[PDB]
Amino acid sequence: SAGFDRHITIFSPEGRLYQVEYAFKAINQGGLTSVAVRGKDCAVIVTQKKVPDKLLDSSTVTHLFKITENIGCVMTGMTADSRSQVQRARYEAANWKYKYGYEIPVDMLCKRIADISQVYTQNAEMRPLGCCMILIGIDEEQGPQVYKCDPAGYYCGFKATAAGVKQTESTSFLEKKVKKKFDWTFEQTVETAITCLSTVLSIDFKPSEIEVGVVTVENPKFRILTEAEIDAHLVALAE
Amino acid sequence: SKMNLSEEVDLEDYVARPDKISGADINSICQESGMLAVRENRYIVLAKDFEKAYKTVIKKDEQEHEFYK
Amino acid sequence: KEQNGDVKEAASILQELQVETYGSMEKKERVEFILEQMRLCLAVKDYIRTQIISKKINTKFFQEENTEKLKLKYYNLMIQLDQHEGSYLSICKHYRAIYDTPCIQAESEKWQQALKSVVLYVILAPFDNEQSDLVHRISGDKKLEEIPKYKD
Amino acid sequence: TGYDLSASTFSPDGRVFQVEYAMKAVENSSTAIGIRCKDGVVFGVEKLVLSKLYEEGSNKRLFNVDRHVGMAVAGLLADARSLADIAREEASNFRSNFGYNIPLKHLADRVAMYVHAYTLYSAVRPFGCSFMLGSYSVNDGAQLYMIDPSGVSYGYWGCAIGKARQAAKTEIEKLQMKEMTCRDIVKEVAKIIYIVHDEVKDKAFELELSWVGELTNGRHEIVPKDIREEAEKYAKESLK
Amino acid sequence: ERGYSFSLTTFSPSGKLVQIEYALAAVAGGAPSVGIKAANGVVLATEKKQKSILYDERSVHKVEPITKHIGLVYSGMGPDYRVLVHRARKLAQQYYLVYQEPIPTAQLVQRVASVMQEYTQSGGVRPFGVSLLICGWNEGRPYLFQSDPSGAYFAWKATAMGKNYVNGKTFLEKRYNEDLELEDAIHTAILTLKESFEGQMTEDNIEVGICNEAGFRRLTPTEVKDYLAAIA
């Protein structure tokens, strides 16, 4: 049964690609968790910021990457593979803008990244990148958009999603959340994201242990909240 | 026919569901509903615990990796 | 809420409180809360819940130092429950347990009333091996002379 | 076992075991530390002189990637030299394509991608060396970066790679590196290197210092002999 | 003969390419899909049931257009479906550039089957773990085909692939008549999916496309809801 799990191109007798599943398991090897919530007029990503050393430059530990002035991404999994996929996505966005004039939709960013991942899955040349990408962007005529891209090459839009070690619990908490109809304001969206992360981690969430990226209809620019804004959101959440 | 059940518990609402479940699944649903009623310290099985147990048992995707489907 | 006449609401409010969960809570305090739940349930006549709570409480606490009041109240509530149920033998056994308490034994009128209840309820019990055994045990008691009519 | 021969194979629990083997291969090398002072970066490398026949400065683990960038390689020496050549080529290409010295953050990113690209294919093995890139400029301050065999890179205020990474990190955290200029950070680095060195196991060794900072106008250069001797004297004076 | 289940370029002693059969098993373990051809056109329906409400139903569409008059649904791996869709669209555009006429359904099916075959003739490449059900309209006649990872394409009148495909086929041959219409086809396809659909058919849980004379069009969720109400 499990003797077919050494080459990504080998189908198991049950029709399962085990190497892709192993990349999915490697997604959790980063040890962190990221949650994305799409509000009525904004999208928000919050990721764990684990700096287990006073010597690290906390500025460069960021897992939030700006793929394009309007499209932001949060990475989960191995850091090197995630950064490689980030540069690939940035190059794809630049190529789209150069070849078609207008800015690439987040739809196409995740679609192209998933296509590259699938090509790596079908041709046994490169090991699949065990990094999950979550892209947020204000796509005109559709509002905010949040998309998730996996090592398998399956890209999907989400009202709210999560990735990392605590993915099932965060997704369950969000599923409990997005069901009770509510005014998904920007503050409400950040509140939902932070509450998801705190509930699944049971952490008091000092402002330096998390990173928040924000895109809004009012300003369709990928913005990373400063520590003061994180503190303000946390104290608003507590009361 | 052995469980306490209740008047408001209408098994038909669970029979009419189009989900393809087996006799083992039926027994699991009944036992889980009874345990849910017991945990909340209730000697009479209500419809809410039946619905919760049915939803718990019905979920059989687990991961599914969302690309095999 | 009970003092305002909301006996049903008070019983419902006290029912959701699970005493066993609070481990740090003192055993005597836990049993007092259990007995209060018993009393509220009997006031609202939820006899199935009262039976469940009776199964909750253990019978080895009443053989301790200061548990005389708790034992008396618990056995009075159990007597009321089985009085509604009609199990005369269980009522007789509960009254026998009451009569064996040192506090009731010391006071004259209280032990006399306890023995009266014991003999009357063992009389009420249907004839069987256990009822005959209890009749033999109660009859072979010297204090029955203090109640001549009941002894006869 | 079985999921262990190639860097393109994912273990059932989800990790590339060849990469981890490269990391613990780096772990067996001699310690090398890097500390960014208030106005620069100082690299201090211990070098185990395996044979007395080697001349002084042979197998130097300080590499000048660019005019302003220095490296503090640790691990396989040949892999370190190849990665130094790759970093030099990347810096030269950036200079020829953009007309100015490559920012150390971008250079670290590019060399990190080059390292990571060797952890994907079964035809090539992951790089067996982990290095430090340090630079200083009047427009970007002082920057230090660390790249492991996995290719993961972020900036550090001060760090060590090799055998006694943790032992040197304990003595690195007790410095207020945000404040002092590298003139004294040099002797502090020398003292840390001398403490972390195991004389009973590594036998003799040579300490090589390098720095890049405002005191060096921005160019990365080996520390002159006078300052090296002063720092070694300071380190030796701390025997008790 | 487990020793011959790994190489895609090695015949078993019984002369079976086992890896292609494993790809077909992966196809059969996919989401249920049905495709039925009536005298008025073709209907392709599929179950787009997400794992939770969080997934955006309208983000990705399973039933996709290739040309104005050709549509195509799938059963099997998801990511390979997009690659096959892109190659089918590119082949259609190449045929249009060469001949100035929209590509016939049979020719597109043949070229797509050849494309799928190209991934089964070498080691180190995996066969497309998806099966394609392609609808088209040319020369006043509906056309329905099924292309496989093996590169074999047939001309199904009415079929079902994916989970419980045997149940779908058994439901067919009963509710299927060659003289039906597109509306009756829609109803029959929805019922056939209902034979293998777990839960309520929410309008967002089912994707239906029609290949009629006017071309191929994927049904909007409003029309899907109307048809479901007419059926249930």
Curated annotation (Swiss-Prot), chain A:
Modification Phosphotyrosine occurs at: Y154
Modified residues annotated as N6-acetyllysine in this record: K97, K99
Residues annotated with Phosphoserine modification: S12, S58, S59
Alphabetized InterPro entries for the sequence: Ntn_hydrolases_N, Proteasome_alpha, Proteasome_alpha-type, Proteasome_asu_N, Proteasome_sua/b, Proteasome_subunit_alpha6
Major localisation: cytoplasm
Subcellular location: Cytoplasm; Nucleus
A Pfam family matched in the record: Proteasome
Protein task: Component of the 20S core proteasome complex involved in the proteolytic degradation of most intracellular proteins. This complex plays numerous essential roles within the cell by associating with different regulatory particles. Associated with two 19S regulatory particles, forms the 26S proteasome and thus participates in the ATP-dependent degradation of ubiquitinated proteins.
Family in the record: Belongs to the peptidase T1A family.
Assembly and binders: The 26S proteasome consists of a 20S proteasome core and two 19S regulatory subunits. The 20S proteasome core is a barrel-shaped complex made of 28 subunits that are arranged in four stacked rings. The two outer rings are each formed by seven alpha subunits, and the two inner rings are formed by seven beta subunits. The proteolytic activity is exerted by three beta-subunits PSMB5, PSMB6 and PSMB7. Interacts with ALKBH4.
Protein name in UniProt: Proteasome subunit alpha type-6
Gene name as annotated: PSMA6
From Swiss-Prot, chain B:
Coiled-coil zones: none
Residue numbers carrying N6-acetyllysine: K48, K52
Domain of life the protein comes from: Eukaryota
Subcellular location: Cytoplasm; Nucleus
Summary of the function given for this chain in its UniProt record: Component of the 26S proteasome, a multiprotein complex involved in the ATP-dependent degradation of ubiquitinated proteins. This complex plays a key role in the maintenance of protein homeostasis by removing misfolded or damaged proteins, which could impair cellular functions, and by removing proteins whose functions are no longer required. Therefore, the proteasome participates in numerous cellular processes, including cell cycle progression, apoptosis, or DNA damage repair.
Family label: Belongs to the AAA ATPase family.
Oligomer status and interactors: Component of the 19S proteasome regulatory particle complex. The 26S proteasome consists of a 20S core particle (CP) and two 19S regulatory subunits (RP). The regulatory particle is made of a lid composed of 9 subunits, a base containing 6 ATPases including PSMC4 and few additional components. Interacts with NR1I3. Interacts with PAAF1. Interacts with TRIM5. Interacts with ZFAND1.
Protein name: 26S proteasome regulatory subunit 6B
Source species: Homo sapiens
Name of the encoding gene: PSMC4
Portion held of the full protein: 350 to 418 of 418
Swiss-Prot record, chain D:
Induction: Down-regulated by antioxidants BO-653 and probucol. Up-regulated by bacterial lipopolysaccharides (LPS) and TNF.
GO MF assignments: ubiquitin protein ligase binding
CDD domains referenced in this protein's UniProt entry, alphabetically: proteasome_alpha_type_3 (cd03751)
Keyword tags: Acetylation, Cytoplasm, Host-virus interaction, Nucleus, Phosphoprotein, Proteasome
Gene Ontology terms: biological process: proteasome-mediated ubiquitin-dependent protein catabolic process
PTM sites of type N6-acetyllysine: K52, K201, K225
GO CC, alphabetical: cytoplasm; cytosol; extracellular exosome; nucleoplasm; nucleus; proteasome complex; proteasome core complex; proteasome core complex, alpha-subunit complex
UniProt-annotated location(s): Cytoplasm; Nucleus
Pfam family, one: Proteasome
Known function: Component of the 20S core proteasome complex involved in the proteolytic degradation of most intracellular proteins. This complex plays numerous essential roles within the cell by associating with different regulatory particles. Associated with two 19S regulatory particles, forms the 26S proteasome and thus participates in the ATP-dependent degradation of ubiquitinated proteins.
Protein name from the UniProt record: Proteasome subunit alpha type-3
Gene expressing this chain: PSMA3
From Swiss-Prot, chain E:
Modifications after synthesis and translation: Phosphorylated on tyrosine residues; which may be important for nuclear import.
Entry-linked Pfam families: Proteasome (PF00227), Proteasome_A_N (PF10584)
PTM-bearing positions, type Phosphoserine: S5, S12, S14
CDD domains: proteasome_alpha_type_2 (cd03750)
Coarse class of the protein's main subcellular location: cytoplasm
Membership in a protein family: Belongs to the peptidase T1A family.
Entry function: Component of the 20S core proteasome complex involved in the proteolytic degradation of most intracellular proteins. This complex plays numerous essential roles within the cell by associating with different regulatory particles. Associated with two 19S regulatory particles, forms the 26S proteasome and thus participates in the ATP-dependent degradation of ubiquitinated proteins.
Name assigned to this protein: Proteasome subunit alpha type-2
